[PDB]
Amino acid sequence: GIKLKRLSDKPVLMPKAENEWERAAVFNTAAIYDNGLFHLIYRATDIGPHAKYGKYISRLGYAVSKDGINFMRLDKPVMSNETEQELRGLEDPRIVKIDGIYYMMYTGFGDRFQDDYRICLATSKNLIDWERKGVVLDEPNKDASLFPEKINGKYVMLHRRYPDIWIAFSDDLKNWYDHKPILKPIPNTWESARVGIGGPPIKTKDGWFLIYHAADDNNVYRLGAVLLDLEDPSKVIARQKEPILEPELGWEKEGYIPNVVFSCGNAVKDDTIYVYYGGADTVIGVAILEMKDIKFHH
Ligand SMILES: OC[C@H]1O[C@@H](O[C@@H]2[C@H](O[C@@H]3[C@H](O[C@@H]4[C@H](O[C@@H]5[C@H](O[C@H]6[C@@H](O)[C@H](O)[C@@H](CO)O[C@H]6O)O[C@H](CO)[C@@H](O)[C@@H]5O)O[C@H](CO)[C@@H](O)[C@@H]4O)O[C@H](CO)[C@@H](O)[C@@H]3O)O[C@H](CO)[C@@H](O)[C@@H]2O)[C@@H](O)[C@@H](O)[C@@H]1O
Numbered sequence: 001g002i003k004l005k006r007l008s009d010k011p012v013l014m015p016k017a018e019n020e021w022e023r024a025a026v027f028n029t030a031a032i033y034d035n036g037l038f039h040l041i042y043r044a045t046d047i048g049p050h051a052k053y054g055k056y057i058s059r060l061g062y063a064v065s066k067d068g069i070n071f072m073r074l075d076k077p078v079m080s081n082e083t084e085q086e087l088r089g090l091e092d093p094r095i096v097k098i099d100g101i102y103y104m105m106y107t108g109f110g111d112r113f114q115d116d117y118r119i120c121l122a123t124s125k126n127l128i129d130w131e132r133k134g135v136v137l138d139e140p141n142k143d144a145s146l147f148p149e150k151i152n153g154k155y156v157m158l159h160r161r162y163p164d165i166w167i168a169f170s171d172d173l174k175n176w177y178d179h180k181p182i183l184k185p186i187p188n189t190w191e192s193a194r195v196g197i198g199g200p201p202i203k204t205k206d207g208w209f210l211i212y213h214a215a216d217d218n219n220v221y222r223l224g225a226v227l228l229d230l231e232d233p234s235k236v237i238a239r240q241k242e243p244i245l246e247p248e249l250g251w252e253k254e255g256y257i258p259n260v261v262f263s264c265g266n267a268v269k270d271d272t273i274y275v276y277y278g279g280a281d282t283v284i285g286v287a288i289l290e291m292k293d294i295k296f297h298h
């Protein structure tokens with residue numbers, strides 16, 4: 001069925017030894033195509049992103065490309081660890097643009113107590129200057145994004161009350177209602193342990209195309225695909241049984257976290273989806289899917 005095609009056998013972005021904030025790893029990047037350019041807001045750590053390596057701090061960098069493969073990168077992070085909720089940094093951003101404003105949801109990792117991580121919101125007009133809007137849901141949660149437009153006059157968000165993908169609605173982004181689970185793990189498969197969104201969903205004629213990730217019982221992360229109904233995105237029209245992307249290359253299989261492909265961003269240019277993904281929580285790669293190749297067996 002659906003399979004992402006890698007544009008390169010090499011990463012499109014790698015850590016940079018000269019800059020402490022991105023010395024160890026760059027991964028799990030937001031992505032958006034705007035004004036003729038691919039833009040990445042990428043997660044970066046000073047240390048390998050696991051407790052076994054040390055007290056890593058995640059910050060958000062900016063990179064830009066004309067072709068979606070060769071990137072230029074800014075020397076400093078566009079968002080750094082500023083609040084108490086962000087003591088251990090900002091993780092796994094997802095960005096959409098609605099009416100001239102970029103809405104970035106990210107995980108603020110505090111680690112002051114058990115499950116001290118929260119979905120936070122920041123907005124920008126330019127992807128460089130970010131204004132914090134605070135915690136979105138005051139509960140242990142992550143893997144969140146707005147839909148790229150309002151549905152029936154309402155903001156809609158995906159989130160992940162472990163281990164399932166959830167949806168919720170809001171008039172003003174301040175209070176949320178109609179919480180319901182939309183996607184769950186399937187036992188004795190590649191997607192048994194947990195699920196979560198990839199990048200933000202993409203609107204097509206047949207429905208909302210949503211890339212999701214899942215872990216198996218050996219903690220191998222892969223990507224999958226689902227189609228949601230346009231008017232009621234809680235309804236799953238189709239879900240592909242097989243993954244669309246798996247760890248295959250050396251920099252996907254080996255790194256700080258072995259056997260991981262993980263996406264927080266899918267940019268669109270001329271009916272081609274550019275899916276950016278972290279490899280082994282260490283580097284960033286890219287793989288494509290043409291709109292016309294979005295075909296579900298059901
Ligand atoms: O966003 C922060 C951080 O998230 C990372 O991934 C998430 C998660 O991280 C670990 C931890 O997750 C715990 C729990 O951890 C397991 C184990 O649990 C303890 C105890 O905490 C539980 O209460 C108890 C069950 O009642 O079991 C105990 O054994 O602790 C181990 C050591 O810390 C850890 O290896 C085990 O995975 O796992 C459950 C799901 O199974 C989580 O819901 C729960 O939050 O969270 C802390 C921060 O609070 C982290 O420091 C730990 O690394 O790991 C999950 C997979 O196991 C993953 O799904 C979560 O996303 C990374 O994404 C990282 O990059 C990021 O900085």
